Amino acid sequence: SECVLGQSKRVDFCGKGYHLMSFPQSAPHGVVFLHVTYVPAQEKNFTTAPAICHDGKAHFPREGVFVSNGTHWFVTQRNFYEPQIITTDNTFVSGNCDVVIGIVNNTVYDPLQPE
Amino acid sequence: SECVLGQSKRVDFCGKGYHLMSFPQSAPHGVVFLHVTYVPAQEKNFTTA
Amino acid sequence: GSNVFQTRAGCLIGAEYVNNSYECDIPIGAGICASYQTQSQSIIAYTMSLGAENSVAYSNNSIAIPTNFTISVTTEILPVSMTKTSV
Amino acid sequence: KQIYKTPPIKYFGGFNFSQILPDPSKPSKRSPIEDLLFNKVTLADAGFIKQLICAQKFNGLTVLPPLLTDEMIAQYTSALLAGTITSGWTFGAGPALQIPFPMQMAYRFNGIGVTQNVLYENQKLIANQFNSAIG
Ligand SMILES: *[C@@H]1O[C@H](CO)[C@@H](O[C@@H]2O[C@H](CO)[C@@H](O)[C@H](O)[C@H]2NC(C)=O)[C@H](O)[C@H]1NC(C)=O
Ligand SMILES: *[C@@H]1O[C@H](CO)[C@@H](O[C@@H]2O[C@H](CO)[C@@H](O)[C@H](O)[C@H]2NC(C)=O)[C@H](O)[C@H]1NC(C)=O
Ligand SMILES: *[C@@H]1O[C@H](CO)[C@@H](O[C@@H]2O[C@H](CO)[C@@H](O)[C@H](O)[C@H]2NC(C)=O)[C@H](O)[C@H]1NC(C)=O
Ligand SMILES: *[C@@H]1O[C@H](CO)[C@@H](O)[C@H](O)[C@H]1NC(C)=O
Ligand SMILES: *[C@@H]1O[C@H](CO)[C@@H](O)[C@H](O)[C@H]1NC(C)=O
Ligand SMILES: *[C@@H]1O[C@H](CO)[C@@H](O)[C@H](O)[C@H]1NC(C)=O
Ligand SMILES: *[C@@H]1O[C@H](CO)[C@@H](O)[C@H](O)[C@H]1NC(C)=O
Ligand SMILES: *[C@@H]1O[C@H](CO)[C@@H](O)[C@H](O)[C@H]1NC(C)=O
């Protein structure tokens, strides 16, 4: 009722890993489930910073993490590498650049200033 | 499987209140769970629309 | 008189202790297992290996992110009913 | 599948974990809470070689010992705890990945509908409350 007719957010209940689909089959006095699941692969190191301080104010990712390879800071998802340039659309401001720990300066890119 | 290796959205399953994480310990013929939970505090009135 | 080893669940006759570690087939008890293995022909007893050793590299400002994935298909089997009978 | 060693140095951004992490000083390699739990429970027999009520059972009533000695169970507990403290929840669904503890705490906060700025501004207070509760 859970795995087949829907998608389950429970862990290890429907297969091992993140759950995608299920398929039922019949057997003598029993049932057999086929779980189609999603599992990550080879990874890379990165250097992170919990927040960004552009103009005396903190900045936080709307959805993702802040990473940097060796020269530029990017915001990405949690389960797949996809760097993008940080703009005001991907961040929300709350703070005064004095209370958080581990913040780095960098800068952001306004999308409307060029226009 | 649920409370430890992840976060659970089931109400009043992994500890009372909103759930944050858990830590296991082993006892003679059994297991002991330590749940870390989040609970609100003093509140204020407001007018809503 | 030969190949006699005393364990925490009685002594064992007919096997030789080994200082290596393997995933064990026949559970003896008290963390001691036994199996058939070469040196070419002998039954050996040893302490089980909990698993493959590993370590992480936790640090103040280090994160790890995957760049690829994989779709997998496992399987699960469950009984649903037994034979009906009458007397 | 595997066993994860504890990090060499126990600093986690103000959080304290001495009461639950393994204690190398004790011979049993058990955490203080585990040791207190072990001491509190009074057990009768564990299948050890016997030679007064337990002695009166020479009538074919024997007690086999458990397969896993209660020393390697502590190894499993330590492995799971180290994995969940140094890798978040990603080690339960694939290869373990490192991540700083405050980031993991912020994301667990974000899970229940509280923006992470709350944590990043009240880190010290949260750490002190956690330490007091554990104490
Ligand atoms: C990148 O990540 C790898 C792991 O994927 C790190 O490699 C381990 O680093 C620790 C740090 O002390 C060493 O103890 C291990 O021996 C390393 N692994 C191996 C197989 O040797 C690596 O340190 C990370 N950083 C860099 C710059 O490579
Ligand atoms: C992710 O891993 C898969 C593993 O299969 C990669 O797919 C292989 O890609 C190479 C590159 O041309 C092919 O020669 C192989 O035939 C592919 N394997 C299969 C089974 O189709 C895939 O390329 C990886 N992702 C990226 C971005 O490289
Ligand atoms: C917090 O961690 C510190 C070490 O990082 C612990 O420090 C000592 O712990 C012993 C254990 O009982 C105490 O007797 C000492 O008084 C502690 N000294 C200091 C300077 O902290 C400390 O115990 C940990 N906190 C708790 C509640 O266990
Ligand atoms: C790191 O990312 C920047 C972003 O554009 C890129 O230019 C650079 O080639 C990458 N690699 C290194 C080693 O800087
Ligand atoms: C960011 O720059 C300001 C002045 O330009 C400086 O005072 C501050 O220390 C910088 N940030 C960090 C984390 O050093
Ligand atoms: C195996 O280890 C023990 C100590 O646990 C040692 O006494 C013995 O010499 C080693 N080698 C054997 C049993 O062949
Ligand atoms: C993390 O920061 C603390 C701050 O005092 C420092 O003591 C510790 O050595 C740092 N660890 C790493 C791995 O950078
Ligand atoms: C078993 O016999 C040996 C003989 O040396 C002795 O040392 C040991 O204490 C005995 N154990 C028990 C439980 O009687």
Residue C18 CB burial class (10 angstroms; 0-12, 13-18, ≥19): middle
- Is residue C58 within 8 Å of residue C64, measured between CB atoms? no
C60 pocket-lining for ligand 7 (C-beta < 6 Å): yes
Contacts of B1 (CB under 8 A, 6+ apart): A11, A12, A13, D92
What method was applied to determine this entry? Answer: cryo-EM
In this structure, the residue with its CA closest to atom 4 of ligand 6 is C19
How far, in Å, CA of A17 to CA of A9, rounded? 11
| Ligand 1 center to A93 CA (angstroms) | 35
Q: Are A74 and A84 in contact (CB under 8 A)?
A: yes
Give the H/E segment covering residue D123: helix D117-134
Task: Give the closest residue to B34 by CA, choosing from D77, D14, A12, D99.
Answer: D77
* Distances in whole angstroms, Cα of residue C23 to Cα of each of D50, D78, D80, D88: 30, 20, 20, 28
Q: Are D112 and D101 in contact (CB under 8 A)?
A: no
- Give the side-chain half-sphere CA count within 13 A for D14: 15
Q: For residue A102, which ligand has an atom nearest its CA?
A: 5
Helix (H) or strand (E) holding A14: none
The set of residues, in sequence order, having a beta carbon less than 8 Å from that of D127 and lying 6+ positions away, is D13, D14, D15, D16
Contact A50 D93 (CB under 8 A): no
D73 CA: distance to closest CA in chain A (Å): 22
- Cβ neighbours for A30, distance < 8 A, ≥ 6 positions apart: C77, C78, C79, C80, C81
Rounded to the nearest 10°, the torsion over CA A73, A78, A81, A87 is -40
Q: What distance in angstroms lies between residue D74's CA and the mean position of ligand 7's atoms?
A: 28
Contact A54, A108 (CB under 8 A): yes
* C-beta A45 within 6 A of ligand 5: no
| D62-72 exposure pattern, b = at least 16 Cβ within 10 A, e = fewer | eeebeebbbee
Resolution to 1 decimal place, in Å: 3.6
